[PDB]
Amino acid sequence: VRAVIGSTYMLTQDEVLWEKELPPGVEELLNKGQPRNKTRVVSYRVPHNAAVQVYDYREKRARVVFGPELVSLGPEEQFTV
Amino acid sequence: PRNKTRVVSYRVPHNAAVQVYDYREKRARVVFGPELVSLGPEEQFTVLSLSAGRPKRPHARRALCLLLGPDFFTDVITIETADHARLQLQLAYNWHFEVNDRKDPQETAKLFSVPDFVGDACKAIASRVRGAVASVTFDDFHKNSA
Amino acid sequence: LSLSAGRPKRPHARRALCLLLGPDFFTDVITIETADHARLQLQLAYNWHFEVNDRKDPQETAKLFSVPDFVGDACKAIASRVRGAVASVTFDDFHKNSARIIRTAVFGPRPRDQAVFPQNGLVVSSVDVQSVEPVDQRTRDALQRSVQLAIEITTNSQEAAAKHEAQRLEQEARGRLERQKILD
Amino acid sequence: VDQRTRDALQRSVQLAIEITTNSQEAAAKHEAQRLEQEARGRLERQKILD
């Protein structure tokens, strides 16, 4: 599974859309901070003077994103609640 | 319902640890921090049974992971002063697990040795406070309790 | 194994295929009596673990299972030491020193930091007193009057201190006024 | 074995608490008298300085 980001895309013969499930509390916090199309890349607009912690459970890479930024999650990344 | 044929996996929280034992390879492992822990055919999670609530009742919470990071648990204890005044004291204790080397098998297995760290620390500290205040009068205690 | 369980520690209440070895604690509720006959219900928790020197020694290891009920033996043994020590102590001396009296009674009189049971290698490392209470309400009512009298003592001490400063300020004003009349 | 013997011991318990209550009030009385005299002795001196 991989995130295809930034350009008009045609699914090659081997590919299908994959639905990203989120913990039962996270899906509401994305709407409060704004039905979700589960196949679209999950993104959050970080406020000014705030930080978000994300963990990549596949690449095993931790990241904290500061300030106003758009944070998008990879297939196995998750937000810290 | 869980598909029993799919590999069992758990997303370990940040500042937490999980203890797994391989009952076939006979290899013990503790997994720290944010990580995905998957179980082999005969591996099993260690299940903690912990004290919970304000009066701290035993076996009230169950967990697959030991939370390690700086946190606090509240406890309500009844104590008695030297002049017999009986006081209900509400406390909160800040706690964390100190780990010197996350690669040491013996230090790391030691974290899971006590079956209920919450219940033990609350029960231990309450007895020290009760023991000290029993030798102090209520007027001296009220002005110096902190 | 057939082991003792519950807060009053009844025998044969739990059965198990495995002896838990690691650091843990069992609670016990014991009734004791002081030198002046005050009868107290004392709640205790004892931290314990089995000390094993060599996990490959057949004799040291077989020794762990020799006692049929280690919980029942250790609770019964320690309760008798606490009851035996407190029977020689008055209720006032006991109330103010209970944590030290119990620690000394259990570990001993030779000072030590732990109690070892050599029959199976069980070690008790602490006694944490949870509470102490008179068994009869008529004994609690007598202590509740002592609390009221201790608060009245504290209230009187406050008024007496206020009275002494009022007299000091009154005299300090009066002495300056008496002088000023002579200067006028 | 007999309740009539336990009641006799329960009276000794009540008297031991009253003994402790009296011992407490007597100590408060002795400190009140010490402080009262310590105030009075300083006031008597201040009147002579005034």
Swiss-Prot record, chain B:
Tissue spec: Present in most normal tissues. Higher expression observed in epithelial cells with secretory and excretory functions, as well as in cells chronically exposed to xenobiotics, such as bronchial cells and cells lining the intestine. Overexpressed in many multidrug-resistant cancer cells.
MVP repeat windows: 8-70
Compartment(s) where it occurs, according to its Swiss-Prot or TrEMBL record: Cytoplasm; Nucleus, Nuclear pore complex; Cytoplasm, Perinuclear region
Post-translational modification comment from the UniProt entry: Phosphorylated on Tyr residues after EGF stimulation. Dephosphorylated by PTPN11.
Induction and repression of expression: Up-regulated by IFNG/IFN-gamma.
Purpose: Required for normal vault structure. Vaults are multi-subunit structures that may act as scaffolds for proteins involved in signal transduction. Vaults may also play a role in nucleo-cytoplasmic transport. Down-regulates IFNG-mediated STAT1 signaling and subsequent activation of JAK. Down-regulates SRC activity and signaling through MAP kinases.
Subunit structure: The vault ribonucleoprotein particle is a huge (400 A x 670 A) cage structure of 12.9 MDa. It consists of a dimer of half-vaults, with each half-vault comprising 39 identical major vault protein (MVP) chains, PARP4 and one or more vault RNAs (vRNAs). Interacts with TEP1. Interacts with PTEN and activated MAPK1. The phosphorylated protein interacts with the SH2 domains of PTPN11 and SRC. Interacts with APEX1. May interact with ZNF540.
Domain observations: MVP 3 mediates interaction with PTEN. MVP 4 mediates interaction with PARP4.
Protein name (record): Major vault protein
Organism for this UniProt entry: Homo sapiens (Human)
Range covered out of full length: 451 to 596 of 893
